[PDB]
């Protein structure tokens, strides 16, 4: 159900997030709350965005 009047905010409700980056597709009914920097290249960059 639409919830603009509950979870919107002028300037952006940045309290809601989504995971653009992880190694493999999420298994069905799995959740991962880990916020670990996504190494998309070969070089280990010591967790700096």
């Amino acid at each position, epitope marked *: 159900w639409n919830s603009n009047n509950l979870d919107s905010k002028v300037g*952006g409700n940045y309290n809601y997030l989504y995971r653009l980056f992880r190694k493999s*597709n999420l298994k069905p009914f799995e959740r991962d709350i880990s916020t670990e920097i996504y190494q998309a290249g070969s*070089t280990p960059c010591n967790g700096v965005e």
Partner: antibody
Amino acid sequence: VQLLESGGGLVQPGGSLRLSCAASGFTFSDYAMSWVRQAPGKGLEWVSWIYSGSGNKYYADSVKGRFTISRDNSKNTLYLQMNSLRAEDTAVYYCARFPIARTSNSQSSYDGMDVWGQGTLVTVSS
Amino acid sequence: VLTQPPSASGTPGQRVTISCSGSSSNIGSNAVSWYQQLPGTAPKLLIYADNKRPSGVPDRFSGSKSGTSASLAISGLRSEDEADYYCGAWDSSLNAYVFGGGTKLTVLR
């Protein structure tokens, strides 16, 4: 998807001004943004690149210090403050959307400068 | 620096190979991209990966990165195929998306 630049015009040498790039048609926060310089009748000279304000901003070796790129995801705009402008910078500036987020099935200009705005023209001359 | 030929050419219907080369930091360990800038227009990304091609681009625009040399193969040239073809790759060392010199493709009429 459209990127519209504004702020291109007459600039006194060593002057200061602000290119504003209004981006519409895509989720502005998900794609990196960049500025690309093209001297009149010359090749594409990359200006700068950004993804997050708190992250690392990348600048060309010739513009390090005198240029400042920034975002405004609330306004879906990309800003470029250029100050202490030098003579060779008279050019056309393109605001280019640099996708960095590839998804599983959706294959989209990942890491390619995807869409380029019409570009404004900056004249650094007295 | 992605060392790229200044002006390659070929007759219409031919398969022209635009081969640029940088370094391991330039292109060997990073994804190369190929852009087609027609005169007076913004560049269009023809190749995004070392090989892959975005949708909306003719299938003839093939790309292949062998080691440090990236080849953009344009097969079946036409009056719309004449443009400046740049190769660009991120640098792990210099930290810059270094472009190629810019190959000026022209058709043999």
